[PDB]
Amino acid sequence: VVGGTDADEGEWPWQVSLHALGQGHICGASLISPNWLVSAAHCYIDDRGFRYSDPTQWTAFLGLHDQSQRSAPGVQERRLKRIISHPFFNDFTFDYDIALLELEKPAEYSSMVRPICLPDASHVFPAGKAIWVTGWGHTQYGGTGALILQKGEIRVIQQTTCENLLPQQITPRMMCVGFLSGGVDSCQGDSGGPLSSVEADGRIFQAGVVSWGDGCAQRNKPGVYTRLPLFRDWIKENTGV
Amino acid sequence: QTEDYCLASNKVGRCRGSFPRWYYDPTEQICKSFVYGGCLGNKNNYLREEECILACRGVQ
Numbered sequence A: 001v002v003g004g005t006d007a008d009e010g011e012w013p014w015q016v017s018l019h020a021l022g023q024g025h026i027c028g029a030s031l032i033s034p035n036w037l038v039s040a041a042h043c044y045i046d047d048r049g050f051r052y053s054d055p056t057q058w059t060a061f062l063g064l065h066d067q068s069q070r071s072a073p074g075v076q077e078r079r080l081k082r083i084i085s086h087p088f089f090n091d092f093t094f095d096y097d098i099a100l101l102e103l104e105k106p107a108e109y110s111s112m113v114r115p116i117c118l119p120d121a122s123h124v125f126p127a128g129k130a131i132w133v134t135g136w137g138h139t140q141y142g143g144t145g146a147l148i149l150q151k152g153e154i155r156v157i158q159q160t161t162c163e164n165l166l167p168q169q170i171t172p173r174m175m176c177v178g179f180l181s182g183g184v185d186s187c188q189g190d191s192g193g194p195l196s197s198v199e200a201d202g203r204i205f206q207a208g209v210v211s212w213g214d215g216c217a218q219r220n221k222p223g224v225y226t227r228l229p230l231f232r233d234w235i236k237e238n239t240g241v
Numbered sequence B: 001q002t003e004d005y006c007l008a009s010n011k012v013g014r015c016r017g018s019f020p021r022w023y024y025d026p027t028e029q030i031c032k033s034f035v036y037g038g039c040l041g042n043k044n045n046y047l048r049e050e051e052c053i054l055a056c057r058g059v060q
Ligand SMILES: N[C@@H](CCC(=O)N[C@@H](CS)C(=O)NCC(=O)O)C(=O)O
Pocket: A109, A114, A115, A116, A117, A118, A202, A203, A204, A205
């Protein structure tokens, strides 16, 4: 997160850190029930050197605040049993960039670990609404990560503006969130983490999934996120959640 | 091969994962660390420094 500030302890108890074998933190995720996380598909693709689609290669840290303190009281460490990437994910256009991760054993809800609410299929996050992105990613494009979870307040951008700003790149599965003036954005290391939106009861709902960007925090180049509402049924079909 | 595997600039790309990788820098003749976003990378991009070293040692 570029242009953010330190999160409070306990502030985003749904934020999860995913570590791949020998590689440390790669992607975020969000806890949605005792057994399931939502993350980005492009985090979990096999390549020439390493099987990122293989669930045995990962460890999820829940309740984590500071990456240097992974055995702090309340941190829960979990292996993964399953990684389900959206069947329509395209690793070249980044369309349908969403994955479901099944934990090998349930998370225990606590003051530090709690699921985010999922929006119903018909919900619309309106243009202009202030929402939050969180993660341990870079504080500048090509720069270093954050030990302490960062939070940044950003705004939903009109789809038409989004398409015009990033021509031939935006599909209806995507949403631009950020500032046309730049300065605040997600960045490398934040992929798969949730957008958090305060809703009508004051509870927080997930608005989307950190996906991609042209650099970070640049003017007229807001972060691009996978939409959540259109995947509500797919998530239910696969998880029961 | 060598043009792509050893001489190309490092490419972070647009995706926002933080994949720690190595690339060969022919101006320094050593392999250095960078953070790959996870999508659409080029060939000068290695999982371990030893592979980068094997692939590119000596290239100018
Ligand atoms: N954790 C309770 C449900 C209460 C709960 O933590 N709900 C979550 C998911 S709807 C929530 O309100 N999170 C958003 C927030 O705390 O603002 C259970 O075991 O059923």
